[PDB]
């Protein structure tokens, strides 16, 4: 479906500037850094805990394989 | 009126690549489609240029691949571009599928199923590609994996010897593996066009899982400029491997020629199969192991039926998000475990991981959807 | 050569009238005339 | 060299009139007795198609050349229809008059009306009419005439819907061949010499020749659910050229014939104040005066809210009754004359409107009456003549037309 | 006096013919500059290790 | 009313040059375009540098590999072949005849009839030094290896069909169309020759 | 079956942009020549490969001429032996693997062309192997011929300690200690397995710089085009 | 009753409210929902259109609204329920009749 | 009697000035009717945000009485002498004029003077005309043309007084007291900002003396603090899209920054705009029209109507086009329109520029027909240019334009420049600003 | 001729991690060499020692080359 046949919209105004009138990086660090920390804080304890568990099951299983190959004092 | 909408060839290009209405809000996870296309073209070129110097005879094969890397001008950079390009393909593929799972793009059933076929074909291609150098892991990998089909009752043993064209992986096997490996990418090319042909019936999903018809932007320039940037970052990843770590994702044992006596210590496929290799080894019975390895990929075709949430994307769905990232972490565990020897504690961890894989897809993520619904009074 | 006071389109919604001050001048006083051209928009007069 | 109008009537009937004023621009108008009135029930809307049909291919010039050639030199070709006349008009800078004149003669004296071009043009009848009928004055005035007459003036300027797609090439040829003739034509000019116009008219406009309007009195009522009701009520008036017609024109300006001040309350308009006394919600009223060769219509046009249409029309009609009964002072009739006198001179102020009056007169009368003589004829209208015009309207058989939600619009016999 | 970017626009970037010629010229000048400059950085980083640096000992 | 609509303030987003609402942006328009198109132009020069190198390498691949260039040329020692005798060599999977020619063989092949030959070539343009003639030992008609110091014309003779070559390698009497082929070569130091 | 993996020695080519020490390669070749080449083959390296790396054209021609090699047939139909040239590969010790086993008590000496690439640890591994030979610990003994090396898998190898102090004199007069001889031969075996190394890293540098330039430029082009949408303000104005 | 504490928590965790969306804006459009949407009155439809457009625009920038402007849990009107309920109730009637 | 000659003997425009600074300008001819009026450098551009729409509010009150003629006395006197009284307000120019019998010019000038200077502005009359303006503001919402042009200005000259509408926001209309209106008047209605223009049958000498008699009291001094100078207005490359699918046809208005009144380039730009020209669905020409945009539009039924404009303000303006089309035609209209701008920039021909010249020659010679448009040309030209420019001078500027000029002049304003876009209605198809902006250049020239 | 290797191997041998591992090595040396008939050996203890030793050797052997 081409533009002109997508959907019905009414009473919605959109203002915008030319890209030659404006900056590529407005407040890039000023507002970017806090928005990143907000986004990171928001997803951290959905994303991270499984990978912490992988790190633990990995480092546990690796050095358990090393101990198992050593002799037992008997 | 213009000669972009009028001319039969430009019409197709204008509607599928320029004036294509795309959602305003699609994220970086939507770039992997175009990057898979770039990977496919990249493999075909590098591949074709390698095929100008390679030979599929068992005696000369390993030597031809080294002759490429030593004597052919820039044959090394082509060779290792092609090998790491296969890794870049699979990275791109799993990211692309994960996007589909998380954001529920799989509701586009036809697009999704053709996807599954594409995945399976790129696997078949890359399995047979790794055999062509005719090193140890090539030869021994091909031997063990092919011979899994002997586990089928009645016919299995015949089937395996018919693939081989003989009683082991030898002269007739390598030559046909070169022929099939050449033709399949072109078949992928065609199936990928059918893939998009279905995608353009619905247009793209977006991160919200909510219809974007009220906020469509033309593909050009917005996503043509993003795809350039994406391609640039794909080439960085590729060339970082080719120029600073060409052997990192391969194996040393594929630099000794194939020896039918001398077995390598811990024979394994390339990193992107290790998850499914681990699932195979979890199950003690061999036929059961093959049916689990088969179901570990084909379960992708089941995913759409298992959808229970009244919301499409996982964006607004915390339980599912966690279970999804558990499923990813589990696959990372299966890849780790797949690369290990069959011993304690890698057997038990592998079993536990393999149960968790199927448990997450068939039981927990469906339940989570229904719980989320009842939390919203739905 | 000169464009008309009003560009004419078909199927375009009419301009509403909400007061005396805009409605005066409309009451017809003389019989109709119809002009058509090459360059100027078509008009209908009182 | 200050210049005045020249005038000629050839023995074949055709009138040439031309003021050489040495302006940069040159207006030429070929006026023809070929308005909608000369249609019958078999070829209705033929003159409408004919009006749209200039710039179709002619014998001496293609459809392409008429458009491109005229545009090339910055020019204009217009075609204007009343009920009684058609007027083909060309403008340009004075150096390109003989190029435009050649096109004008081709259009009027030798059109081909090719089957494929004529057929291709049929949808334009629908578009042109559709546009025109956006103005509700067009509905009402076209219906008013249709109600008021049995035959010629009843005809609409626009082609009836059923005829659209069915006006034939033969009908267009017939219409031109029977109406575009020397005895029915006047060639008017500004910024061109009279002798060269005369010689064009002798050499290219000598072409051989080819019923009275019965007043009826009726009503037509367009029910359409608008919140405003347009309505016109008229009676048979007087033929243009007669002295009685001047009395109606003065009565028109006594009663009120459209606005003088922007956003003004119309303090001198007798109708507007008569209506505004009773009803203060949005409305408009004006005296309506059409005047033709055979006949005329005089009355008034209301625009009112649906519910108040009854009150507005009766109020307006009552105002004419007091004028007809004798309530009419000199200061009103003097003011009304000053309006009419000023309006006429202002209408011929531009060289567009001047051309229209020169050609208009040339068909309906023998020759040109100058502005000073017209103003003297307005002054000749006595207060007695105005009261007679009003009296004629009150006792005259009425014609009416309305459009809107007519639930409270009265019929003629409710008035 | 107009700014540097403005001089670049009016002289080189406005006509697409000059814009293209500019890129092709710039690419030649860039190629040799970048190659020569990057090779210097490489060979300084590996001073005395390359055949180029030890060539003179056997000629 | 639509007159109530007022366009939002874009000051946070605007470029410095167009912040001042009381000044004309036309001064800065030349500049603002310049900046953005410089970025585009610089990018294209970078991509050109890349694509040139990428394409050029791929093209280089198809040109002769290092092992094929290794067999391209062959060194021959001129003091190891005595005056009169032929010496055969292996060159690009072919025989390669080098021949030290005597005072007699030089002068006898110098004053030969130019027209009588089937392939007219004079001797001083078939060789670079008069006393050395280097030839491919492939008989031109249907491919054999000619035997040295034999034939009627005292040079090379083939027992396959019936060809007779002179001491300069030119066909004299037989079915061969072309003469024996003169390869590309150059003498380095006076004792050595590289063919190829 | 315990395992001791090698430590990471600070090689002169360890870093991202660090090239091979070509003087170390020149020594390392001589350690293959003088010591290994009677036991190990190195089939993929020819005498021409040395040119423009560790030796000149003329030096490499001398090294090639020193060795015997079979060629044929001649017109008689016989296989003769001739002095080598640049086109010849490094000559195999034995005619075949079965012959090689007999000369080394069953064990086959692997080809060294790719041994750095074909073993985990690479040059770190080989250096540790060559210098790590020691007397066995108490409770241990292997078959007569299998020596003890702590870095070899399974703790026992069938190679006699090949290097020691002054096992050869180097052409540039470097004191040939066991550690020096191992370091040099490893540097050569690194190059043997990966000739591209130096070009590869030169390319790496040029890629890193081009990306340092293009990524932020293309990212700026992206932000420029997208600034129309990122700035935009929306308003809902229902009647 | 007792799980109303968890419902309130989950609502904010889900976080569609941070884009000024109501729950019924996030519902996945199947054929029933499409029909239910199609039956909305001018006002409810155009508000839906805007709310989504605003969310999509926020999503594009990877930003959220100010906390004042977030959809309150209590004020989340279930605007689509009565239309969707009947669309489904209708379909099940046809499906019954078809057997 | 040729065209070049005709221009030489067109009546000259007389020019005199009063002590206070009021300019009296006159074109005379033996005509029984005349038009006379006052043109003022006043409008929305001179208004701040807190008093926007004051000049429009005044316009409503101007003809509703004076101190000398209270209420409908002013109205009655105009009507009873057959005179026609009229006003208009633009962003830079307010104007009141009267069409009258030539013999009644003294009274005409007297009445104009009474309106301007002694305007009643009654309490009750203000509160009545308050609701009237609110209903006009509502009528104006139904005119998509009016709305889209107000939007073009609003976005084009955003954050300046040129962004403001003439009528003002309804908030101001509802609150403006009579104190605001009288303050607005005494600041802006000053003799040096004003012109008394007249055309028809009238001796210039008599008009000057009539101006003395009635407009002498007009103030033409400014106090030490403040004097109404217009600041320049920043054009912004911007877009405003009011999406409303419930309407049947889409209005689009697009333009680049024009040069403004004084600049000679305006003549070449008029010629270029004449080439592209204008069209609507009632035009007889269709496919055979000379303008490629019009012939393409007609044959493919792209739009219902379009015109090119060139709107001039002091140090800036709006140069472009407006069109009205089907919701599926907006992309194609824009493509062909922008395509014409590029073709004129890069590759305009001599014969088509000759056509454009001839159109423009005809345009402004036939526009000055009747006393009212001539009076208006006198009034405004004195404000914009500082003088009336005779037809002979326009002709000289027009003959100077050849194909090379049209290229160079169009390339200055159109080629690779950021436009302002306004769309209203079913504008889903309306191209993205980047696609519009990229359509302001060709990858060839 | 003295090898830089054997010098540094001694230097590294006298660190806490080496000498503690060397005592572990010597413990089982005179446990298995004193006891009769047990198939236990001392490979593990040697490898613990070498891992710690040769890690240190690596850190500064290449200085002398
Ligand atoms: C929602 O986004 C969509 C929608 C539809 C499509 C679609 O139909 C197709 C065919 C692709 C696609 C597939 N393969 C390769 C490319 C490609 C090739 C070269 C490029 O140039 C560059 F790398 F920049 F140099 C850039 C992209 C694009 N991508 C899509 C993305």
Residue numbers in the entry:
A (entry chain G): 2 to 75
B (entry chain C): 2 to 379
C (entry chain I): 33 to 78
D (entry chain B): 20 to 229, 235 to 439
E (entry chain J): 2 to 60
F (entry chain E): 1 to 196
G (entry chain D): 2 to 240
H (entry chain F): 11 to 109
From the paper:
1 is the central component of the mitochondrial electron-transfer chain which is responsible for the electron flow from ubiquinol to cytochrome c. This occurs via the oxidation of ubiquinol and the reduction of ubiquinone in a process called the Q cycle. Ubiquinol is oxidized to ubiquinone in the oxidative (Qo) site, with two protons released into the intermembrane space, while ubiquinone binds to the reductive (Qi) site, where it is reduced to ubiquinol and takes two protons from the matrix. This process allows proton translocation from the matrix space to the intermembrane space, thus increasing the electrochemical gradient across the membrane.
One quinolone, SCR0911, has been reported to have improved solubility and metabolic stability, with nanomolar activity against P. falciparum. 1 in space group P6522 and data were collected to 3.1 Å resolution. The resulting structure showed clear and continuous density for most of the protein. H in the Qi site which is not accommodated by the protein, and its size and shape allows unambiguous placement of the quinolone compound SCR0911. The carbonyl and amine groups of the quinolone head group are placed close to His201 and Ser35 (at distances of 3.1 and 3.2 Å, respectively), allowing hydrogen-bond formation. For SCR0911, the head group of the quinolone forms two hydrogen bonds to the carbonyl group of His201 and the amine group of Ser35. The hydrogen bonds to Ser35 and His201 contribute to the ability of SCR0911 and GSK932121 to tightly occupy the Qi site and prevent the native substrate, ubiquinone, binding in the active site. 1 inhibition assays showed that SCR0911 has significantly decreased binding for mammalian target than GSK932121 at 100 nM: 9% inhibition compared with 64%. Interestingly, Ser35, which forms a hydrogen bond to the quinolone molecule, is replaced by a bulky Phe residue that would form a steric clash with SCR0911 in the parasite enzyme if the binding modes were the same.
